[PDB]
């Protein structure tokens, strides 16, 4: 049930790391290179572990992860849609 998501991704507790730009994510527990304004201390309900593409703030673009690249703080992650 965690492998399928609908729209902007607040229900994805998946595993994908690769973004739409082919760039890896930075760990949710890591302040380097990006200091998480939202981290696994204010929203423990969400499953934010290692560098998995997770959207906890319900952003319209889609499931995201704090991008490893210093250039961009957050980028989406390729995924199909649950339930066709």
């Amino acid at each position, epitope marked *: 049930e965690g492998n399928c998501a609908e729209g902007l991704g607040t229900n994805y507790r998946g595993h994908v790391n690769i973004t739409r730009s082919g760039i*890896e994510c*930075q*760990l949710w*527990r*890591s*302040r*380097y*290179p990006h200091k998480p304004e939202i981290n*696994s*201390t204010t929203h423990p309900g969400a499953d934010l*572990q*290692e*560098n998995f593409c997770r959207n906890p703030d319900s952003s319209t673009t889609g499931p995201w992860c704090y991008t*490893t690249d210093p250039t961009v703080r957050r980028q989406e992650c390729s995924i199909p849609v649950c339930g066709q």
Partner: antibody
Framework: LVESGGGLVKPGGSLKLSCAAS????????MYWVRQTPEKRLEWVAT????????YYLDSVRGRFTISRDNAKNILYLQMSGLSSADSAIYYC????????????WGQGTSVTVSS | QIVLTQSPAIMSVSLGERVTMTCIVS???????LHWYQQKPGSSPKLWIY???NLASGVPTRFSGSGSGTSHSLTISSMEAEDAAAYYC?????????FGAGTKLELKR
């Protein structure tokens, strides 16, 4: 800051081992356990999250080791099982730290071996 | 990714000479996920380099981190001799995480 790191030689089977870690807050940092075989080789042996929510393990370590911590008592624990001859190692308990899955504060280091 | 190989096994470097330690990993899926350490003879390991070229606290400023693809190498250029230790290369990779093979830095007299 400081971890104790007890333990000793066990020739038969499982060993109960732990590090008493205090000085910082255990509600904000992951714990890491690292072993070092006598042939100067380290294989990371499991790691625990800020609670008991998510714990890891190596390919040969899954199903044998076990990492859990007690935040209130400021103690970090590690239980081994099926300690074969190749499993002898100088283990180190380590603080997550520095972000990005680093190894901030390594413990004192306990020498553990098996030999009958 | 997933796994990691190191190179070489044993070095015997002198005092005041530039030193490198390659870490041939498979394609370096995250150039800022690889770290190095030391282990002085009889000690616990201490972090030196975390997430490529960014030193931890108290690390001598003579270290460096490359790693723009499939090859990560340190560059220690220091006049002091205390750097004699077994430096280990670790790339963070979740469950299949692996350390280096050891690049034990011995001395020369």
């Amino acid at each position: 800051l400081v971890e104790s790191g007890g333990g000793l030689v066990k020739p038969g089977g499982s060993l109960k081992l732990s590090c008493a870690a205090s000085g910082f807050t255990f509600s904000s940092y992951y714990m890491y356990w690292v072993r070092q075989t006598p042939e100067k080789r380290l294989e990371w042996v499991a790691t625990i999250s800020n609670g008991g929510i998510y714990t890891y393990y190596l390919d040969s370590v899954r199903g044998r080791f076990t990492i859990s911590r007690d935040n209130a008592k400021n103690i970090l624990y590690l239980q081994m099982s099926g300690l074969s001859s190749a499993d002898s190692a100088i283990y180190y308990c380590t603080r997550d730290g520095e972000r990005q899955g680093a190894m901030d504060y390594w413990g004192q280091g306990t020498s553990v071996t098996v030999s009958s | 990714q997933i796994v990691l190989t190191q190179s070489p096994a044993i070095m015997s470097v002198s005092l005041g000479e530039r030193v490198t330690m390659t870490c041939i990993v498979s394609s370096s899926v995250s150039s800022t996920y690889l770290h190095w350490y030391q282990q002085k003879p009889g000690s616990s390991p201490k972090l030196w380099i975390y997430s490529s070229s960014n030193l931890a606290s108290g690390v001598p400023t003579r270290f460096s981190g490359s790693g723009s693809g499939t090859s990560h190498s340190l560059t220690i250029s220091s006049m002091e001799a205390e750097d004699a230790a077994a430096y280990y290369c670790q790339l963070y990779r979740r469950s299949p995480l692996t350390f280096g093979a050891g690049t034990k830095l011995e001395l020369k007299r």
